[PDB]
Write an enzyme that holds these catalytic residues in place. Structure first.
Site, PDB file in Angstrom:
ATOM      1  N   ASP A  12      48.391  -4.493   2.368  1.00 20.64           N
ATOM      2  CA  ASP A  12      49.036  -5.803   2.294  1.00 20.64           C
ATOM      3  C   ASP A  12      48.144  -6.750   1.490  1.00 20.64           C
ATOM      4  O   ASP A  12      47.288  -7.434   2.051  1.00 20.64           O
ATOM      5  CB  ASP A  12      49.296  -6.332   3.705  1.00 20.64           C
ATOM      6  CG  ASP A  12      50.093  -7.622   3.710  1.00 20.64           C
ATOM      7  OD1 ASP A  12      50.359  -8.164   2.617  1.00 20.64           O
ATOM      8  OD2 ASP A  12      50.460  -8.082   4.811  1.00 20.64           O
ATOM      9  N   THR A  13      48.359  -6.798   0.169  1.00 25.14           N
ATOM     10  CA  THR A  13      47.563  -7.678  -0.683  1.00 25.14           C
ATOM     11  C   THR A  13      47.806  -9.153  -0.382  1.00 25.14           C
ATOM     12  O   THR A  13      46.954  -9.987  -0.710  1.00 25.14           O
ATOM     13  CB  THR A  13      47.842  -7.387  -2.166  1.00 25.14           C
ATOM     14  OG1 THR A  13      49.224  -7.614  -2.474  1.00 25.14           O
ATOM     15  CG2 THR A  13      47.475  -5.951  -2.516  1.00 25.14           C
ATOM     16  N   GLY A  14      48.934  -9.497   0.240  1.00 23.21           N
ATOM     17  CA  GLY A  14      49.200 -10.858   0.655  1.00 23.21           C
ATOM     18  C   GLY A  14      48.569 -11.264   1.966  1.00 23.21           C
ATOM     19  O   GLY A  14      48.829 -12.366   2.459  1.00 23.21           O
TER      20      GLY A  14
HETATM   21  C1  LIG Z   1      55.043  -6.788   6.712  1.00 21.25           C
HETATM   22  C2  LIG Z   1      54.612  -7.964   7.612  1.00 21.25           C
HETATM   23  C3  LIG Z   1      53.972  -9.099   6.751  1.00 21.25           C
HETATM   24  C4  LIG Z   1      53.264 -10.106   7.685  1.00 21.25           C
HETATM   25  C5  LIG Z   1      51.964  -9.470   8.268  1.00 21.25           C
HETATM   26  C6  LIG Z   1      55.129  -9.848   5.947  1.00 21.25           C
HETATM   27  N1  LIG Z   1      54.589 -10.956   5.155  1.00 21.25           N
HETATM   28  C7  LIG Z   1      53.874 -10.624   3.880  1.00 21.25           C
HETATM   29  C8  LIG Z   1      52.331 -10.810   4.076  1.00 21.25           C
HETATM   30  O1  LIG Z   1      51.666 -10.405   2.937  1.00 21.25           O
HETATM   31  C9  LIG Z   1      52.022 -12.280   4.358  1.00 21.25           C
HETATM   32  C10 LIG Z   1      52.217 -13.148   3.138  1.00 21.25           C
HETATM   33  C11 LIG Z   1      51.721 -14.581   3.481  1.00 21.25           C
HETATM   34  C12 LIG Z   1      50.433 -15.148   2.825  1.00 21.25           C
HETATM   35  C13 LIG Z   1      49.945 -16.567   3.176  1.00 21.25           C
HETATM   36  C14 LIG Z   1      50.733 -17.422   4.179  1.00 21.25           C
HETATM   37  C15 LIG Z   1      52.018 -16.854   4.838  1.00 21.25           C
HETATM   38  C16 LIG Z   1      52.507 -15.433   4.488  1.00 21.25           C
HETATM   39  N2  LIG Z   1      50.598 -12.383   4.718  1.00 21.25           N
HETATM   40  C17 LIG Z   1      50.156 -12.538   6.141  1.00 21.25           C
HETATM   41  O2  LIG Z   1      50.908 -12.803   7.018  1.00 21.25           O
HETATM   42  O3  LIG Z   1      48.764 -12.349   6.374  1.00 21.25           O
HETATM   43  C18 LIG Z   1      48.189 -12.858   7.673  1.00 21.25           C
HETATM   44  C19 LIG Z   1      47.232 -12.094   7.999  1.00 21.25           C
HETATM   45  O4  LIG Z   1      46.022 -12.539   6.989  1.00 21.25           O
HETATM   46  C20 LIG Z   1      46.124 -13.823   6.863  1.00 21.25           C
HETATM   47  O5  LIG Z   1      46.167 -14.261   5.346  1.00 21.25           O
HETATM   48  C21 LIG Z   1      47.415 -14.565   5.071  1.00 21.25           C
HETATM   49  C22 LIG Z   1      48.090 -14.989   6.492  1.00 21.25           C
HETATM   50  C23 LIG Z   1      47.488 -14.232   7.438  1.00 21.25           C
HETATM   51  S1  LIG Z   1      55.584 -12.345   5.106  1.00 21.25           S
HETATM   52  O6  LIG Z   1      54.955 -13.450   4.394  1.00 21.25           O
HETATM   53  O7  LIG Z   1      55.830 -12.824   6.455  1.00 21.25           O
HETATM   54  C24 LIG Z   1      57.123 -11.776   4.287  1.00 21.25           C
HETATM   55  C25 LIG Z   1      58.182 -11.019   5.101  1.00 21.25           C
HETATM   56  C26 LIG Z   1      59.459 -10.529   4.403  1.00 21.25           C
HETATM   57  C27 LIG Z   1      59.656 -10.787   2.913  1.00 21.25           C
HETATM   58  N3  LIG Z   1      60.853 -10.328   2.263  1.00 21.25           N
HETATM   59  C28 LIG Z   1      58.581 -11.549   2.096  1.00 21.25           C
HETATM   60  C29 LIG Z   1      57.314 -12.035   2.787  1.00 21.25           C
END
Ligand SMILES: CCC(CC)CN(C[C@@H](O)[C@H](Cc1ccccc1)NC(=O)O[C@H]1CO[C@H]2OCC[C@H]21)S(=O)(=O)c1ccc(N)cc1
Lengths: 99, 99
Positions: free
Chosen positions: A25-27
Site C-alpha cells: 500500500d504505497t498510499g
Molecule cells: C485497502 C484499504 C486502504 C486503507 C488502509 C484503502 N485506502 C487507500 C490507502 O492507501 C489510504 C490512502 C490515504 C492516504 C492519506 C489520508 C487518507 C487515505 N492510506 C491509509 O489509510 O494509510 C493509513 C495507514 O498509514 C497512514 O498514512 C496514511 C493514513 C494512514 S483509502 O484511502 O481508504 C481508499 C479506499 C477505496 C478506493 N477506491 C480509493 C482509496
C-alpha cells in the site's frame, strides 16, 4: 520482483512466526495488521485515514519478512480493514513505483 | 519515472485543464479525488478506509493525464483528505511495483 496492478498487490508476509497476506500500500505511511499477539511491549496509538481513526497497538523494531525480503520496523496492530504494508517497510525492502 | 517511497508518492495530474497533486496509491482499488464539481451523471458509492466508510460519487470514463500518459476510467469524488490515483488508472500507464 515486478508487480502489476490489475489485481490487489497481495503478498505473503511472515511476522511473529506466522504467515499472513498483506497488501502493498504505497498510499499508507505506516504498516497496520489485523489483531495478533506479538512479543514485547507495545504502546497504545491511534492512526487515521478515510473514515476517521482507529485504536492500534504499536510494536517497535519488529522483524517482518515481506515476499522474501527482511524488514525491521514499526508494526501497528488493530482493527484494520485489511493488512497493509506501508512506506515505512516498503522503503526498507527497496520498493519503488515505476512507469 | 521511478518514484521512491521515502515520502508520499505525490505527482502532478491534469484533469479537465486543472492541475492537482495526487497520490499514486497501489492500495486504492479506484481513483478518488477531493471534492470537485464535475458535470455529468454519477453513481453513489461507498469506499472503506482505515477508519470506516465514506460516501463518494462515481463518475465513468473520466480522463486524467499522469506524467505524459493519458488514462480514462472510473474516478470517484468525495470528502477525501488527499487526491488518490488508484489501480484502475495506474494499470493503464504501465505502473508496476518493483523490489
Ligand atoms: C485497502 C484499504 C486502504 C486503507 C488502509 C484503502 N485506502 C487507500 C490507502 O492507501 C489510504 C490512502 C490515504 C492516504 C492519506 C489520508 C487518507 C487515505 N492510506 C491509509 O489509510 O494509510 C493509513 C495507514 O498509514 C497512514 O498514512 C496514511 C493514513 C494512514 S483509502 O484511502 O481508504 C481508499 C479506499 C477505496 C478506493 N477506491 C480509493 C482509496
Amino acid at each position: 520482483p515486478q508487480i502489476t496492478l490489475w489485481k490487489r498487490p497481495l503478498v505473503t508476509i511472515k511476522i511473529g512466526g506466522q504467515l499472513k497476506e498483506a497488501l502493498l500500500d504505497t498510499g499508507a505511511d505506516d504498516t497496520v495488521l489485523e489483531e495478533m499477539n506479538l512479543p514485547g511491549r507495545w504502546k497504545p496509538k491511534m492512526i487515521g485515514g478515510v473514515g476517521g481513526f482507529i485504536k492500534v497497538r504499536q510494536y517497535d523494531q519488529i522483524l517482518i519478512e515481506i515476499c522474501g525480503h527482511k524488514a525491521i520496523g514499526t508494526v501497528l496492530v488493530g482493527p484494520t480493514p485489511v493488512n497493509i504494508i506501508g512506506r515505512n517497510l516498503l522503503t526498507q525492502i527497496g520498493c519503488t513505483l515505476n512507469f
